[PDB]
From Swiss-Prot, chains A, B:
InterPro entries, A to Z: ConA-like_dom_sf (IPR013320), Galectin-like (IPR044156), Galectin_CRD (IPR001079)
Tissues with expression: Expressed abundantly in the bone marrow. Expressed exclusively by eosinophils and basophils. Not detected in monocytes and neutrophils. Expressed in CD25-positive regulatory T-cells (Treg) (at protein level). Found in intestinal tissue from patients with Celiac disease, expression is directly related to the histological grade of mucosal damage and to the number of eosinophils found in the duodenal lesion (at protein level). Found in sputum of patients with eosinophilic inflammatory diseases such as asthma (at protein level).
Name of the protein in question: Galectin-10
Gene: CLC
Source organism superkingdom: Eukaryota
Keywords: Acetylation, Cytoplasm, Lectin
Subcellular location: Cytoplasm, Cytosol; Cytoplasmic granule
Amino acid sequence: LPVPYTEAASLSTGSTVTIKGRPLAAFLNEPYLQVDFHTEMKEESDIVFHFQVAFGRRVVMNSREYGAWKQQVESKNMPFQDGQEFELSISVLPDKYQVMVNGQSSYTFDHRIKPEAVKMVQVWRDISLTKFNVSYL
Amino acid sequence: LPVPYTEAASLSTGSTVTIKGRPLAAFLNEPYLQVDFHTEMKEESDIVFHFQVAFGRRVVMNSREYGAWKQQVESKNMPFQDGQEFELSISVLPDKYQVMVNGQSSYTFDHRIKPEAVKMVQVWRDISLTKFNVSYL
């Protein structure tokens, strides 16, 4: 898939976003991955859920509300493996997003804005992408 | 051109590396650009000159010597323009690299390792690339 990858989407409780891909560099070179749930089709729109992996180092999550970044949450959990593909699954729960990596629950992020505000998902920075799927149950 | 972009190269006084491209995101979303002059064909090799633009914020330059990052140099000079293509020209002088952006001298970096140690140039992160050239005079 082309990266940056953009897909229109709608989310509610029970939605799952599944991303499958590979970093474009060895962890020694510190590639990044960014997944942004946007409120409008435009890249400059607000971000309900920002998920940013510094491969081999940390994860930060945040929201961008009326143009401004809010309270950053950091996690040093690093289930991604150097030089390997990954399967990333982001589930919408009533109270939070749950982020699974390779089948393992790894991060969560409480809703700051209703997920029904999402209109677009963008996946970008230093990855190649083989699948992107949004599914509802 | 494909990004990450890799080209074998040799450098000495009078060499110029010319890069022409466009960021893949608006500056509000903070795209990056990285240019690394490597000592071997392998991405994990040492880096004689590391040039990293956080578009709209800052530039850092450094070297990676026997696997370890050295003294970072930071510059808040930001001649790159939001949403525009750029022409980036890196000249090898006897004492330093000179970095020109859109015709304007913008950064320099004193040699820590002889430029003749370079065997490979890599251009990556959040850009598209339309030209890459190495020329000698």
